[PDB]
Amino acid sequence: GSSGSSGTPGRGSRVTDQGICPKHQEALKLFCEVDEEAICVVCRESRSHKQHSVVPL
């Protein structure tokens, strides 16, 4: 009985879902708990994710 116990280690230990919004280009410091996508201060204020319960990444 064999098994594909082969894989590569994942280094980093740092968040990446807080880069920059490709819309307003603002430091992503919030995450829409309604769309499940990282957003920026502008996005949150934007009616787009304004009504959505956004949280501080």
Q: Which residues are annotated as a binding site for Zn(2+)?
A: 21, 24, 43, 49
- Report which DSSP code applies to 41: H
* Residues making up the binding site: 21, 24, 43, 49
Q: How far is the CB of 2 from Zn ion (least distance, A)?
A: 46
Residues 27-56 that bind Zn ion (CB under 5 A): 32, 34-35, 40, 42-43, 49, 52
Q: φ, ψ for residue 47 (rounded to 5)?
A: -40, -25
What span, in angstroms and rounded, lies between the C-alpha atoms of 10 and 37? 23
- Comparison of 2 and 28: residue with beta carbon closer to Zn ion: 28
